[PDB]
Design a protein around this ligand. Structure first.
Ligand SMILES: N#CC1(c2cccc(C(=O)Nc3cc(Oc4ccc5nc(NC(=O)C6CC6)sc5n4)ccc3F)c2Cl)CC1
Ligand SMILES: N#CC1(c2cccc(C(=O)Nc3cc(Oc4ccc5nc(NC(=O)C6CC6)sc5n4)ccc3F)c2Cl)CC1
Lengths: 263, 257
């Protein structure tokens, strides 16, 4: 039941940025692969725990819309090897190059993301940092949900715009939940339908945190493109509800999208 | 690690193929999936063993060019769930609806196919039945190797045809199969199309009197490709290259193009 990659086989190449913990490179191992590795002499016991936790999470997943984990190595460095994604993140498409998707596709990118999040939740995985730059649009047609951090381009302002109000406040030692993820998804939906990030009219970062937490500030739903189906706008609204128990789970969401995915 | 899918989650849909050694439908499980089932409710021992063996092989593979295994189920009927491929198989493209790929694309299809076979061999998996129908050209772009059968002589190497030992399948036997696939890609046809008799083909390939007609390769097929093709089809087993070399060749071929 083994996924260790023996030493000397992975050829580390270009250098892409910085992951959850380490540094991500473009590599070669039975084809193009992505290699996250801790560039250190000796791992700390906590660092080695992170590694174990991440390998433990990725090895539970086998789904077209989740980043394909291929193996790991511990022989010179700690290193996770995943598939290599071609193209760019949703964030880059929507907010950097201003890509011009047709609604039929915007809904598809939504549908696929919904599939992957449904899957993760099925296997008791809470993503905790879902956002558009963690959605790679592979080959320009296939969502691949990852946890890149800085492998792909970074968001405007941790990462504030996708945090549900209860996550922002930080009352509990753990405010994260299937529903915290659903709120995140709700903002991704907002991005897709508006083409924009939320709260464009505020330049102060602390003010956004304060207000979204207090439920004084909410995404401006009037900005959704006029050819966006009322089902999708209504669904967006239900994912963005401020009370978390009032948010739908993904089985429901996936249904709702699959429904409107005719006409 | 546990991949058993709880019961009453897979929604079986349209029927895709029957062969008596299983049935395959299209299904819904966290999006689209392929589901291979066993018809008879109370299964046999030989049936149940093949399931454990197939699931055992599949769960060892995580690579972009191999069909993604997603899970298994037993608690109503035995069933294996993989990803659902959109598009058509290589066989179907070449021989049924006769798609004309440009030469850069054909090379690429071959590159990926070898890329996956490299992966399998690395994990000590001999395919034993590589052929154009077992290559799926997913979304007209990514090659997904699989095994959708439920024999096929045209891809069978001499030493396999002759049933030498109880085991004549080797990495080299797959490399031969790969050669026949390269022939299909470059000629656009199946081999020995001028012969209608299966016994004779078996006898003839077996004895080494017959081998594919490399004169039929597209005019703009590179000299390096025609040569690689010849090497992969060498009647003598030990002369055939392994997939690390083949990739090395294919990749160098694409560079000057
Ligand atoms: N399981 C799981 C999740 C999870 C939890 C924790 C960590 C991860 C994770 O992502 N690990 C990971 C990420 C990695 O980052 C990647 C992966 C592919 C990739 N492709 C790129 N392409 C480009 O930049 C364009 C020029 C062509 S950049 C790039 N970076 C690498 C290794 C990992 F383990 C993931 Cl997926 C919830 C999904
Ligand atoms: N790993 C591995 C290997 C291996 C060994 C044994 C069995 C398998 C295997 O394929 N199992 C398997 C296959 C299956 O057949 C499939 C899978 C996907 C699929 N997509 C289709 N698309 C279409 O027909 C057109 C409308 C677009 S049909 C279809 N059928 C199903 C379940 C399996 F376990 C595989 Cl991949 C050695 C290659």
């Amino acid at each position: 039941d083994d996924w260790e990659i023996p030493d000397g086989q992975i050829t580390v190449g270009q250098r892409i940025g910085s992951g959850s913990f380490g540094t991500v490179y473009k590599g070669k191992w039975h084809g193009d692969v992505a290699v996250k590795m801790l560039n250190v002499t000796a791992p700390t016991p906590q660092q080695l725990q992170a590694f174990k936790n991440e390998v433990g999470v990725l090895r539970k997943t086998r789904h077209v819309n989740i980043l394909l984990f291929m193996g790991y190595s511990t022989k010179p460095q700690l290193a996770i090897v995943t598939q290599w994604c071609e193209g760019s993140s949703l964030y880059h498409h929507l907010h950097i190059i201003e890509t011009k998707f047709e609604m039929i596709k915007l809904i598809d990118i939504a549908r696929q993301t919904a599939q992957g999040m449904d899957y993760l939740h099925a296997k008791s995985i809470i993503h905790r940092d879902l956002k558009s730059n963690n959605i790679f649009l592979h080959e320009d047609l296939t969502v691949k949900i990852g946890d890149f951090g800085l492998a792909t381009v970074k968001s405007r302002w941790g990462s504030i715009l996708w945090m549900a109000p209860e996550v922002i406040r930080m009352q509990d030692k753990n405010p994260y939940s299937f529903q915290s993820d659903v709120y995140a998804f709700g903002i991704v939906l907002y991005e897709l339908m508006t083409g924009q990030l939320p709260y464009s009219n505020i330049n102060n970062r602390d003010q956004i945190i304060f207000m979204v937490g207090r439920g004084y500030l909410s995404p401006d739903l009037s900005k959704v493109r006029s050819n966006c189906p009322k089902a999708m706008k209504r669904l967006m609204a239900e994912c963005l509800k401020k009370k978390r128990d009032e948010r739908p789970l993904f089985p429901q969401i996936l249904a709702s999208i699959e429904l409107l995915a005719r006409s």
